[PDB]
Design a protein around this ligand. Structure first.
Ligand SMILES: *[C@@H]1O[C@H](CO)[C@@H](O[C@@H]2O[C@H](CO)[C@@H](O)[C@H](O)[C@H]2NC(C)=O)[C@H](O)[C@H]1NC(C)=O
Ligand SMILES: *[C@@H]1O[C@H](CO)[C@@H](O[C@@H]2O[C@H](CO)[C@@H](O)[C@H](O)[C@H]2NC(C)=O)[C@H](O)[C@H]1NC(C)=O
Ligand SMILES: CCCNC(=O)COc1ccc(Br)c(C)c1
Ligand SMILES: *[C@@H]1O[C@H](CO)[C@@H](O)[C@H](O)[C@H]1NC(C)=O
Ligand SMILES: *[C@@H]1O[C@H](CO)[C@@H](O)[C@H](O)[C@H]1NC(C)=O
Lengths: 47, 605
């Protein structure tokens, strides 16, 4: 239903407020550093 | 006859092998089982092959017209080279540098050449993995970021760059890459890329912290995950819209393309990447097992599975391409129908796909000189299907939008990028093992110096030198590096390996030692391939590449919003100084032979 001279303009979306990519990177890096810490501890545990 | 040209009494002798095989000496890594070694070799081969290299060339040169020469050259050259590489190891019991220095120790240059080539390949790689994981991070949400354009400051219409082009090209070239108009022009560090690259390097270093003893476990799911995901893509990629539409396009050859030999030029290079030859790699994998292993069966099964996986990935890629082309053609036809209907105010349901030409003729006959105001565009299949993307657009641009059109887009997006990440990780494992091993093999490192320290130091150094790719001109530099990395160094390394095996050492002694080690003397096929088939066939393509190096032009597509016909490719040639860069890869291998000859001639007296 178009009026040939009147077009919609109010369509602003604001879905992501926190940039989920940042939190995903953060949890991935936390897991990575935990893994490297346990790996180096086990490697140095070669007593 | 005793065909030993005065090279014995210094190589690890056969009696030395008998003495070492009956007491299992320690201080040497060994695979837990033949499966952990089969699987890691398979993962390295598939990782080097089927990411950013095989599908891109398959869809760039036409498809089918490239698969046939690739298959014939693979079955003629890769199997002999793979068997030779796998059997020269497990015999001299050393790494690539050590193996090539054990016999005829005058040169030792091919080992360091392979070291440098692997280092460069890993340098330009692991940036692809950084981009893959960055695209993976932005998943896990229903409104995928590349599906929609961002609103301008006017809050009424889209941005000009995002409107003249697609949302996906904007999310890649601008939101992620932040590419520059010029090539020499640089920018900030682009902290997103720095964070992603640091994450990639950290996960790689953690995965191979202690070397083989960890990687053998790491591959157990890393070299097997991109086989259970890919298959299901088939059951999705066939029966959605393009069943026997893109696959049929792939299956029919192209006689015109085979006439142009340029495709052949790349095809050979592909097998070097497909079978992971010319690197250190498999040698360190090969010379880590017992002396009672059947190398021929290993080579044949690896080659067969590699060919099968190549066929699989080609089928899936062209399936997605055909589905996308069909969708674009359908939407263009619908736009044409809508234009006619709005022009002449016919009932909406009267014109369809098949009754369009007759109604168009009726419309112009009825009311001439008013139809002429309409702008009609033409669209037919085999015009969208023949369109080829350059660079790394195959997925970041094609597969992303094809996924968005699909119903449950985030799920297949995340699983596809996980597959890609796993393939890249297996690849990086493979060319990482070919690094440090030569460094610890040349034996100048201080004694204690635990391997973890050396791996960390090399990882941080590679991170520092790869810092460059995180700039605003990183994509251009990566394309420039890839335009010359590979091919010629790999061809030179293969020629050196073949020459050293055939002339130095000897074919006859090779037959004797393989017969004593496991038996099953190679039949005439292998002997004729190593004698005149493989070396001559590789030398002719090397010469052909050298000849056509003079006439191929030198340019690259650029992303300049401030330029007319913006959604089109622009070529601006190359700067005058960038040529100097490629010289660093020009004459690496044969530098040390004259130096050693001079040292021998002038040092004795
Ligand atoms: C088969 O391969 C040839 C090899 O290029 C294709 O040729 C290109 O076709 C496009 C559009 O017709 C032209 O712009 C180029 O000039 C052609 N290439 C050459 C040789 O210059 C041909 O279209 C392909 N046909 C298919 C896909 O079956
Ligand atoms: C619609 O009608 C136009 C008339 O303008 C068609 O064009 C002309 O067709 C005659 C052939 O009898 C040619 O000699 C002219 O050169 C054409 N152009 C003119 C007069 O400007 C036109 O072909 C029709 N549109 C379509 C379907 O193409
Ligand atoms: C990632 C940089 C270049 N882009 C590509 O290689 C994408 O092409 C591929 C590669 C592998 C696989 Br499986 C599939 C399904 C597609
Ligand atoms: C990165 O992109 C934004 C716009 O999205 C732009 O303003 C900025 O200048 C870009 N970064 C650099 C160093 O140019
Ligand atoms: C659809 O096209 C036909 C022939 O032009 C004509 O009857 C009319 O334009 C449409 N049909 C009906 C029932 O309206």
């Amino acid at each position: 239903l178009e009026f040939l001279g009147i077009q919609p303009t109010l369509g602003p979306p604001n879905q992501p407020p926190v940039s989920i990519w940042l939190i995903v990177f953060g949890v991935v890096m936390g897991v990575i550093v935990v893994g490297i810490v346990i790996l180096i501890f086990t490697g140095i545990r070669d007593r | 006859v005793l065909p030993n040209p005065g090279l014995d009494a210094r190589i690890p002798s056969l009696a030395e092998l008998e003495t070492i095989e009956q007491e299992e000496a320690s201080s040497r890594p060994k695979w837990d089982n033949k499966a952990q070694y089969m699987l890691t070799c398979l993962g390295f081969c598939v990782g080097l092959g089927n990411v950013w290299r095989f599908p891109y060339l398959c869809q760039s040169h036409g498809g089918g017209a490239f698969m046939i020469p690739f298959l014939i050259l693979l079955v003629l050259e890769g199997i002999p080279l793979l068997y030779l590489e796998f059997a020269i190891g497990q015999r001299l019991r050393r790494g690539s540098l050590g193996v090539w220095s054990s016999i005829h120790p005058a040169l030792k240059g091919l080992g360091l050449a392979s070291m440098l080539t692997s280092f460069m390949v890993g340098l330009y790689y692991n940036t692809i993995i950084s981009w893959i994981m960055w695209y993976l991070f932005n998943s896990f949400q229903e409104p995928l970021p590349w599906s929609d354009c961002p609103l301008n400051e006017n809050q009424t219409g889209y941005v000009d760059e995002c409107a003249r082009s697609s949302p996906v090209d904007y999310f890649w070239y601008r939101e992620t890459l932040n590419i520059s108009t010029s090539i020499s022009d640089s920018g900030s560090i682009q902290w997103w890329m720095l964070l992603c690259l640091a994450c990639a390097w950290s996960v790689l270093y953690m995965c191979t912290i202690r070397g083989i003893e960890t990687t053998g476990k790491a591959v157990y799911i890393t070299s097997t995950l991109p086989y259970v995901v890919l298959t299901i893509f088939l059951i999705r990629g066939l029966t959605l819209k393009g069943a026997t539409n893109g696959i049929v396009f792939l299956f029919t050859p192209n006689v015109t393309e085979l006439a142009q030999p340029d495709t052949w030029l790349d095809a050979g290079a592909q097998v070097f990447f497909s079978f992971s030859l010319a690197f250190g790699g498999l040698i360190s994998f090969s010379s880590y097992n017992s002396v009672h292993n059947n190398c021929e069966k290993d080579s044949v099964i690896v080659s067969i599975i590699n060919g099968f996986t190549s066929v699989y990935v080609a089928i899936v890629v062209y399936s997605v391409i055909g589905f996308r082309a069909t969708q674009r053609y359908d939407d263009c036809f619908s736009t044409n129908i809508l234009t006619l209907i709005n022009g002449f105010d016919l009932p909406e349901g009267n014109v369809t796909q098949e009754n369009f030409v007759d109604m168009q003729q009726r419309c112009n006959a009825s009311d001439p000189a008013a139809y002429a105001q309409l702008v009609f565009q033409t669209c037919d299949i085999n015009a969208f299907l023949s369109e080829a993307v350059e660079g790394t657009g195959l997925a970041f641009i094609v597969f992303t939008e094809a996924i968005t059109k699909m119903p449950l887009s985030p799920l297949w997006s995340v699983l596809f990028f996980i597959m890609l990440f796993c393939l890249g990780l297996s690849s990086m494992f493979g060319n990482m093992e070919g690094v440090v091993v030569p460094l610890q093999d040349l034996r100048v490192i201080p004694p204690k110096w635990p391997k973890e320290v050396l791996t960390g130091l090399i990882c941080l150094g590679t991170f520092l030198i790869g810092f460059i790719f995180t700039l605003n001109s990183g994509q251009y530099w990566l394309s420039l590096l890839d335009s010359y990395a590979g091919s010629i160094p790999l061809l030179i390394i293969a020629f050196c390996e073949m020459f050293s095996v055939v002339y130095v050492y000897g074919v006859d002694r090779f037959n004797k030692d393989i017969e004593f080690m496991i038996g099953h003397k190679p039949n005439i096929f292998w002997q004729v391939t190593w004698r005149v088939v493989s070396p001559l066939l590789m030398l002719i393509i090397f010469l052909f590449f050298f000849v056509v190096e003079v006439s191929q032009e030198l340019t690259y597509s650029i992303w300049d919003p401030g330029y007319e016909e913006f959604p089109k490719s622009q070529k601006i040639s190359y700067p005058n100084w960038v040529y100097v860069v490629v010289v660093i890869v020009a004459g690496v291998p044969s530098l040390t032979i004259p130096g050693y000859a001079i040292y021998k001639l002038i040092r004795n007296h």
